[PDB]
Symmetry: C2
Subunit: 211 residues, 2 copies
């Protein structure tokens, strides 16, 4: 139906155990409520196959750029290169992206990087210039991130690396709108944890009405 | 014996196909020449199992926090939890870290994140304080050899650099008083200078190896 949305989560736990998954689920449920015709796909990076770039991938790709045909690749190469192609094609096919992550050591879980590596593809999300130009000029994106401490303000802002990275990628891809929604401070101020969660949930629902 | 050095690589390919790995090899070979008694340990992130923190890990951890013995965890939980514990212990036990990576999409391969995740442990590499945190690796030092197609050491692309930037944040977090970089950069942007770029970086690696 009218827009395709990728709800992309990088968390091993669910909405009952995670600040990020709780806020993301509030967002996405509300979104669907408001845009009942839209195709909303949950991409759970912990459950799906998300191949890291490895020796097989490089081999396979080498092959393909040497004119060979997908048929010439080894089994394992086909499995991996193939999946990478599905992932990539699914990404460009969608209209909106919603990234949901916990902050682990100032950034996101490793699989989020695997996911990015799988979708950053010449001719699909960007193309090179006589630097590069992003092809995703009419997409839209949102990052929901949970963190123990505050990283929106203060000295600690300089250490934020998750959102920062995603912002860089979005820029690279030419996506003009990248929003952030943070559930921050629950670990630094645990008496405030319920309040922090509730307000983020409320912001998330509100944001869903417009995204 | 002597000093314990972790030579940490995040690459599927080897010294013959990789700029980072070639430069890293020059570095660490020289290091061992200069410091023959030092314990140089290759941590090959594409050969070791570096468990991502997953459902099994949270479960296993929670169990241990709940008083269960390690042997009471599931087979899977035990494998992952034990593996992470080893990685963590190994990191703190070492005196020096050498990170070698390619730049993929402005940062490093996913497994490098896994590795960091495995070694970032409260009471080991840092401690929480009512004021934030404090680093515990006050006697360590680190170097990062990074390879990239284009140039990230100036100007506008420098704001896009995220690999070295990340490792710098982590090292600061850990309280590591010294973290250096060595870049092999520009080889794709200016392929008619790739050989020279490489040769120069290799020379730098050999030089730097005399002090690290
Ligand atoms: C492995 C790990 C690493 C973490 N690293 C950080 C960090 O660098 N900064 C921070 O403020 N909080 C950190 N935390 C705390 C979490 O960010 C916090 O619990 C947040 O709610 C995580 O999201 P979740 O609740 O969706 O899991 C970390 C937690 C874990 C388990
Ligand atoms: C998956 C992938 C992603 C890459 N991303 C970037 C990038 O963001 N910026 C860049 O300058 N070069 C990029 N490159 C090119 C490499 O950084 C360059 O080839 C470098 O020499 C890689 O190190 P290596 O020779 O040790 O493998 C990328 C290459 C690959 C395979």
């Amino acid at each position: 139906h009218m827009a395709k949305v990728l709800y992309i989560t990088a968390h091993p736990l669910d909405e009952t155990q995670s600040y990020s998954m709780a806020v993301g689920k509030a967002f996405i449920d509300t979104y669907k409520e408001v845009n009942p015709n839209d195709e909303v796909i949950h991409i759970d990076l912990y459950k799906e196959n998300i191949p890291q770039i490895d020796a097989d991938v490089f081999s396979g790709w080498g092959k393909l750029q040497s004119g060979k045909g997908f048929e010439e690749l080894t089994a394992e190469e086909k499995a991996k290169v193939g999946r990478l192609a599905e992932l990539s094609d699914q990404f460009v096919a969608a209209d909106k992206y919603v990234f949901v992550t916990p902050m682990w050591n100032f950034s996101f879980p490793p699989v989020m990087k695997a996911y990015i590596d799988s979708v950053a593809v010449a001719g699909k999300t960007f193309k090179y210039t006589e630097g590069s130009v992003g092809l995703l000029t009419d997409k839209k994106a949102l990052h929901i991130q949970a963190s123990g401490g505050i990283y929106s303000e203060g000295p600690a802002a300089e250490m934020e690396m998750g959102h920062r990275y995603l912002q860089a990628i979005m820029n690279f891809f030419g996506v003009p709108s990248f929003e952030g929604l943070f559930v921050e401070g629950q670990n630094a101020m645990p008496d405030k944890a319920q309040e922090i969660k509730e307000k983020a949930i409320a912001r998330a629902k509100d944001l869903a009405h417009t995204f």
